[PDB]
């Protein structure tokens, strides 16, 4: 349930915090961050895809365009005794939502954007899904 | 589950550390990078597949693309007694999110572009999932 | 699982290492390498395979392309008793990704060449996943 | 598994060495090769094959081609009691990723060229495939 | 498995040697055989061919040519009991990938094409696999 | 297996060495030769076949060719009991590949040609298959 997902922001909240104070700095920080999701699973299925399709043009004109798209999925089950049960291909990890605090910031724009290109790299995650705010506590 | 990540991050994140302390340099770094899933596994199938597409062209003009596609596919299962089991051809390593930093670096473009090339090339990480912070701690 | 890779790079990292002292030099080196993968099997098919393609012109125009491809492939399976096993033909190595460090390097055309070319053909590596990097600690 | 590989490359790695420093010579060397896979099994098999091909041309013009080509493969099996069992016909050695280091070597173009045809038309290795490197240690 | 293969390759580097001491000479050698297989089975098939082929020309033109082809193979099993198994018709010697070292060589012409037409024509090895290099070791 | 081979070969080369001493001479020899298989078996077939062929012209023309081949084959099988075996026609032996070394030789022309027209009229050898050598040891 939730608690697998606690984890993950910590471990995230606390790395960016003694990393990003050895930037040049940015003498400090504080942070927070919103998880979407627990683990994802992925589950192995059959499969069948069909694309049929055509154009035409011609003298007068032809012009048509026929665009057809089929695909069925199944998933697969192991089998034991009576029991039935899929299977488990890989697992993923949850996207992000994230933003900051830190002794100094957005005012220096040459400390502003050094970050958000650092941040957003980091996590896969767009600029308009992660902000900042300038100081901390002390200055 | 997760356990099996929070290795890999770490057999990445000592090996760059203690490589690139290594280059002219560049004097000392601290690293984090981000897994997007644990280790894939890849199973057999058996396949059925149709490609049918054709063109015209004529005298006034018969420009027509037909293009059929058709794909099926069926995993496979063992038998022993009652079990049923799929097989196992190989196994992936995940991609890969990260960035850096370092005594020195993005300042120096020639200690900038010479990282880049170092860490894409190493990982399969194109540009812009890979990021670099100036400084460290100590200058 | 992950195993039967580390055993893979190093025997790989200690190859290079030990080789490469021995040119010109080029006086030492540490190095790096990612494996894409674990051991490859392969499994025997029955198959069938049919190609039906045809081609037109004429006085005015017959210009006709009608390609057809369809392939069907099933594995074999061993019997024994109640047991149903597949058919183990060959295992394969997996590809490769990794780069370098060394005592001279890319500032010298002529020992920046040299290596490429002696990498990529012993590993089956293009350039564009093999890096290089000079210096290595001492200079 | 793996281990019929390593068997393999040192078999051909002591052979070179020991033939190659008894040319001209090229007074010492030290290489290293990647096998591509383990021994190759071939099972046999049932076959059909049908290749229905036309072609017409006239007066006018009856420029036309169609080239059907049908294989059908199934293996064949054994019996012994329950017992079913594939049929071993031959058995092939893997191809070869190889270079090299030598005491002398490419800075002489005619103990370059020789080594080059005398390596590939041993293993059947075409040329980009392979590479050498000049010196070796001492000189 | 291989170890058959072992024995061939010795049984002809041995021949070889012993024997072309015995040229004008050239008055020593060491070689190296590379092996392509293990000893090929041969197992007997019923058999059905149909080759239906028609050719057409006319006063204007008939220009025409439909060639089918079509091939069915069944192998034999022998029965006894329960038990059934291939027929054994003969078996086959393998192909080959051979060179040289010699105390004389491919510096004299004459002592350079006698060999090749020589080697080639023993063992059925076209030029191109086979190769050849000048001195040994004392001169 | 290959052992019914070993005898062959020798059975081979020590007659041709006994024979060859007694032309002109042609002092001495000594010898290699390859064997292509061990001992063909042959099997008996029950049969069938179709040959319909047609050819027209006339007036105009008729030019056609309509060519039609069609051939069965079935072995034939005893019985007895349970147990069901083929049957043993004949048997025959394998095709060569040799050549030879001579105290006097191909330098003069008519004790060339004479050995030529020997050796391959007595194994049914092509010239391209077989070789010779000049000298032997001792001049």
């Known amino acids: ?25 940015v003498d400090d920080v504080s942070v927070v961050v919103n998880v979407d999701a627990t683990s994802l699973k992925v589950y192995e299925k059959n499969k069948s895809n069909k694309n049929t399709t055509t154009e035409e043009t011609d003298k007068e ?45 957005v005012d220096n724009v040459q400390i502003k954007q050094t970050i958000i290109e650092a941040v957003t790299r980091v996590l896969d995650v767009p600029s308009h899904r992660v902000a900042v705010a300038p100081k901390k506590i002390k200055e």
Chains 1, 2, 3, 4, 5, 6 share one sequence.
């Open 1 to 25: 349930p939730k608690d697998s997902i606690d984890d993950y922001e910590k471990e995230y909240e606390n790395q960016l915090k003694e990393i990003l104070e050895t930037i040049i700095g």
């Open 61 to 105: 004109g032809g012009k048509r365009s026929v665009t057809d798209q089929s695909s069925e999925e199944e998933i697969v089950m192991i089998k034991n005794g009576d029991k039935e049960t899929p299977v488990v291909v890989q697992t993923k990890k949850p996207d992000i939502r994230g933003v900051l605090v830190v002794a100094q910031g």
